[PDB]
Design a protein around this ligand. Structure first.
Ligand SMILES: [K+]
Ligand SMILES: [K+]
Ligand SMILES: [K+]
Ligand SMILES: [K+]
Ligand SMILES: [K+]
Ligand SMILES: [K+]
Ligand SMILES: [K+]
Ligand SMILES: [K+]
Ligand SMILES: [K+]
Ligand SMILES: [Mg+2]
Ligand SMILES: [Mg+2]
Ligand SMILES: [Mg+2]
Ligand SMILES: [Mg+2]
Ligand SMILES: [Mg+2]
Ligand SMILES: [Mg+2]
Ligand SMILES: [Mg+2]
Ligand SMILES: [Mg+2]
Ligand SMILES: [Mg+2]
Ligand SMILES: [Mg+2]
Ligand SMILES: [Mg+2]
Ligand SMILES: [Mg+2]
Ligand SMILES: [Mg+2]
Ligand SMILES: [Mg+2]
Ligand SMILES: [Mg+2]
Ligand SMILES: [Mg+2]
Ligand SMILES: [Mg+2]
Ligand SMILES: [Mg+2]
Ligand SMILES: [Mg+2]
Ligand SMILES: [Mg+2]
Ligand SMILES: [Mg+2]
Ligand SMILES: [Mg+2]
Ligand SMILES: [Mg+2]
Ligand SMILES: [Mg+2]
Ligand SMILES: [Mg+2]
Ligand SMILES: [Mg+2]
Ligand SMILES: [Mg+2]
Lengths: 184, 261, 126
RNA sequence: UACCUGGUUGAUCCUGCCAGUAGUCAUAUGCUUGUCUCAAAGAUUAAGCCAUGCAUGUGUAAGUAUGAACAAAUAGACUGUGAAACUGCGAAUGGCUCAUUAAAUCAGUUAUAGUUUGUUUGAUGGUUACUCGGAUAACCGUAGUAAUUCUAGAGCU
RNA sequence: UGAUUCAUGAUAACUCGACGGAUCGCACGGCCGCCGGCGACGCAUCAUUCAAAUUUCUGCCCUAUCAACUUUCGAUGGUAGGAUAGUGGCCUACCAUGGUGGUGACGGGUGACGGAGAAUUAGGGUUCGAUUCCGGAGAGGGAGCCUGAGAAACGGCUACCACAUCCAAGGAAGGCAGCAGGCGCGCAAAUUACCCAAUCCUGACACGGGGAGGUAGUGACAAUAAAUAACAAUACCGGGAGUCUGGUAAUUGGAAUGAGUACAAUCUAAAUCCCUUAACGAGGAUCCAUUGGAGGGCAAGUCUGGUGCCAGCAGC
């Protein structure tokens, strides 16, 4: 026996059933270019995650509203959606979970929030800043564009202390240019 | 197999030990002793996983080989010694003394005791019969044998055992109206008042227990352990006092704690 | 060069092993890491240790992004108690013991060669 | 995602299948491959055959030291450490594999008032003896055989 | 005790009974030679624990081109024995003629170990389940057995059969479906590495040992995150004469940065990788993205050259 054999792992996306549907290809490319995604895989995993959330809500809604499992897990699901900024305190019902869309999840990405908070010039500029270790969520540097920000953490997005844009020393391009200028 | 198995695979260990599945291929194989291997807590788990005194398997051996740990008043040096329900664990250097009791979620809890309360324990009587020379004796569910017991003691009763004199100080008859704890099954760790006894000839006897909050649950006679006469237990219980809360109620407390804490 | 604050948590005094054990939090802005040697020189002052050799720090992990590390520390009442309860490899790191170089595979082949001979000749079997 | 599309006719509506579409902790193979984490891996055919090495040994204050052993001491049985050897225990666990096996194995559920069980734990064992006897190992020294933890005889304890 | 002429007692005898301590460490004390402490190891009995053995009920794929099967030599049951740890045709003697079967016996097939489970699943379902957890079974094929609490043991023995090693030819020694490795077989699968540091197991044992197990190497089985550029100014081209906004260029600019490399520290049993970090590290940022397609199904050319029912394409 190897202990490592007991480590779990799973899949995070499914490919479309119809690969060459022109309507779908048009809608997906619009979301990919709007949010600066790397490929269709990034959009497919968000759809995969959304399907899981909606499926959980549908099962709960099919039970009696007095069912203890309906009450307990329903509150947990609503609490989870509120903590990430998907739902509002005025939408505290499982029926509002079924009304969520892919755009709601893509708007909570770190890449989207870095752009819509003014830190970046374009959605594609935010992508490079995140992966280049210029952003931090609170005290922690985050270099994953797919990081899903929480409502309690959205106000702490700032430049990293080690970045040239956050108080750190200038990068190696300016430093070399300064060195060359000094040599003159 | 051609004989006795000496290994316990980690995933086959009892769940109430709460061992991490990636911590290794093996779990401590409980030694033979007063308690069954599935209803015990080996000293290695207690010293390393519960109390954190030892950081590794090796350090538990060092602690025990210095004769610093006692179970039921006697020093124990076996790492996998099966300490079980109602056992008293004492560590003189740290001046600590615990009683192994189940929490309401069915897991062993090291309930800190006072020096006065650490001088006895409760045992459940298994049977009473005549031994050699017609001398009556009783044996318990913790492997103990007591000769010349009180003639009033019968099977399923509870006896108060003094760990110094090693004698029966007092006993409780098994009857409806006493406070009992569940020691096995789904309701393990729950405390209530024995309300009814349903006997079925040739089959297991069912006992209906009612919680202090009116919640009623059933179980088998073999999983019941009388704690006191009437409604007051003879031993100190943990904070929950055997009250099992619903997940909704438990979530309510957690939410309130974050608001205050 | 900046300040280096050391914080400890999950602290407990272990009478059974005659030591203090705790988790070490090291804030080191502007620095790659903090060497274990320097942490011993700083823990000996925060806990008033007469001989730093009774200090053992191990399992250090620098957090992603830098500026903070976490480890585990042990303070022994004396170097004598350390040599009794401390594993050999952690004593070699602190210089309290030497390393005996050996080959396990060679030891096994010597064992199998030595059990074909009886008596005092077992050792002389080359 | 409770979904279908091409193909029989001059054209039509059907039956009906072929083909396409998607997945597989599903294997192989092709081409390609920068970074992080995680991770299966001589099962399928041959439970076919195997060179070599290794995978099981074991010492406490507490069974037995006269190494012609070491160390430190200096008329004593021994009583610092201790190789070897006897004795004790273990090697029936683990690991590997899926050949045979179809109410059999196995699963849930029972029973032993139908038995055995080193060990652990608890309890329990009557109203020459100031200590018996003979052996044997290590050791020692005569050896045999091409040869093996193959083997004979002698002297000790 | 649901239930036992049961637990257990008394009595008459019986046995040629491995039973009832000829053992060891430490500490020295108290009485006037006597007495005495705390331990170790061992014998026996019961209970307990660790388990096994046997066992109740229900449940298994395809096949009837398998309809009868079992019973002299046990098939089904009875009585008395023998054997066994013990129940039992388990075996023997004697007796009876039963037992199973379209509710599929019996026989045959399985590229059939069983289960926990795996894949896909609106629901129902279909398929798979050699493999790390549990149970069983085996150690080249059979059989037999010693030791022992426990084995019909194979990193134990004995024999036969099949293979095969050494030999001075008189003999002797063999069992990788353990780990690594080799041959063969194949569509098909890695190092003859390091270590007991973790997990745990074992011994007289706090200390020895552990190819169990872990660590590293090989590794596009499978899975996760995620680079291969961003921005501004020009030229050019649009949209809402005009001017704001958007799009292109191996143009021009300064900025950003990890792949890589490397002091160091950290990591580790020791190393290594990761994480952290001095220095270094991008313009055609050659630091060059590939694999399949472009009649339809089915996203994408009635472009250009070649070939001319050839060569080829084409799942249809
Ligand atoms: K068995
Ligand atoms: K044995
Ligand atoms: K069963
Ligand atoms: K079955
Ligand atoms: K029998
Ligand atoms: K009979
Ligand atoms: K034995
Ligand atoms: K180890
Ligand atoms: K050990
Ligand atoms: Mg086994
Ligand atoms: Mg019963
Ligand atoms: Mg369907
Ligand atoms: Mg036509
Ligand atoms: Mg088809
Ligand atoms: Mg890197
Ligand atoms: Mg021996
Ligand atoms: Mg068959
Ligand atoms: Mg059956
Ligand atoms: Mg009787
Ligand atoms: Mg009979
Ligand atoms: Mg007969
Ligand atoms: Mg099958
Ligand atoms: Mg088969
Ligand atoms: Mg299987
Ligand atoms: Mg097979
Ligand atoms: Mg395998
Ligand atoms: Mg198995
Ligand atoms: Mg076998
Ligand atoms: Mg073979
Ligand atoms: Mg055999
Ligand atoms: Mg073998
Ligand atoms: Mg074996
Ligand atoms: Mg392969
Ligand atoms: Mg490239
Ligand atoms: Mg073309
Ligand atoms: Mg088209």
């Amino acid at each position: 026996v190897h202990v490592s054999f007991y480590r779990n792992y799973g899949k995070t996306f499914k490919k479309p059933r119809r690969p060459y549907e022109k309507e779908r290809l048009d809608a997906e490319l619009k979301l990919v270019g709007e949010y600066g995604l790397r490929c269709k895989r990034e959009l497919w995993r968000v759809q995969y995650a959304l399907s899981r959330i909606r499926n959980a809500a549908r099962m709960l809604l099919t039970l009696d509203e007095k069912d203890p499992r309906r009450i307990f897990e329903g509150e947990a699901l609503l609490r989870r959606m509120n903590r990430y900024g998907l739902l509002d305190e005025s939408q505290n019902k499982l029926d509002y979970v079924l009304a969520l869309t892919v755009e709601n999840f893509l708007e909570r990405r770190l890449q989207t929030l870095v752009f819509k908070t003014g830190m970046a010039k374009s959605i594609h500029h935010a992508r490079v800043l995140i992966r280049q270790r210029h952003i931090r969520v609170g005290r922690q540097v985050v270099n994953v564009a797919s990081f899903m920000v929480r409502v309690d953490s959205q106000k702490h997005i700032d430049f990293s202390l080690t970045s040239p844009f956050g108080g750190g020393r200038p990068g190696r391009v300016k430093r070399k240019n300064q060195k060359s200028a000094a040599k003159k | 197999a051609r004989g006795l198995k000496k290994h316990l695979k980690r995933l086959n260990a009892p769940k109430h030990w709460m061992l991490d599945k990636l911590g290794g291929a093996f779990a401590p194989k409980p030694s033979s002793g007063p308690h069954k291997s599935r209803e015990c807590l080996p000293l290695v788990i207690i010293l390393r996983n519960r109390l954190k005194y030892a950081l590794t398997y090796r350090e538990v051996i060092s602690i025990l080989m210095q004769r610093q740990v006692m179970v039921d008043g006697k020093v124990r040096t076996d790492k996998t010694y099966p300490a079980g329900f109602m056992d008293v664990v004492t560590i003189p250097k740290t001046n600590e003394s615990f009683r192994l009791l189940y929490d309401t979620k069915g897991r062993f809890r090291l309930h800190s005791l006072r020096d006065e309360e650490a001088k006895f324990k409760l045992c459940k009587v298994r049977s009473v019969q005549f031994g050699q020379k017609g001398i009556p004796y009783l044996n318990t569910y913790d492997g103990r044998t007591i000769r010349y017991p009180d003639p009033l003691i019968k099977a399923n009763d509870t006896i108060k055992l003094d760990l110094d004199s090693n004698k029966i100080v007092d006993f409780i008859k098994f009857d409806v109206g006493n406070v009992v704890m569940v020691t096995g099954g789904r309701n393990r760790g729950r405390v209530g008042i024995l309300k009814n006894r349903e006997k079925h000839k040739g089959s297991f006897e069912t006992v209906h227990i009612q919680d202090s909050q009116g919640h009623e649950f059933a179980t088998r006679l073999g999983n019941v352990f009388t704690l006191g006469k009437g409604s007051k237990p003879w031993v100190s219980l943990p904070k929950g006092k055997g009250i099992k809360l619903s997940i909704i109620e438990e979530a309510r407390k957690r939410m309130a704690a974050q608001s205050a804490t | 060069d900046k300040a280096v604050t050391i914080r400890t948590r999950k602290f407990m005094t272990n009478r059974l092993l005659a030591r203090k054990q705790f988790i070490i939090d090291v804030l080191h802005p502007g620095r790659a890491n903090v060497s274990k040697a320097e942490l011993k020189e700083k823990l000996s002052r925060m806990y008033e240790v007469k001989d730093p050799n009774a200090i053992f720090v191990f399992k250090f992990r620098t957090h992603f992004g830098g500026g903070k590390s976490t480890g585990f520390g042990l303070i022994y009442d004396s170097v004598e108690n350390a040599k009794k309860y401390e594993p050999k490899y952690r004593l070699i790191r602190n210089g309290l013991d030497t390393k005996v170089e050996k080959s396990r595979k060679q030891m096994k082949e010597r064992k199998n060669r030595a059990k074909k001979v009886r008596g005092v000749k077992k050792t002389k079997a080359g």
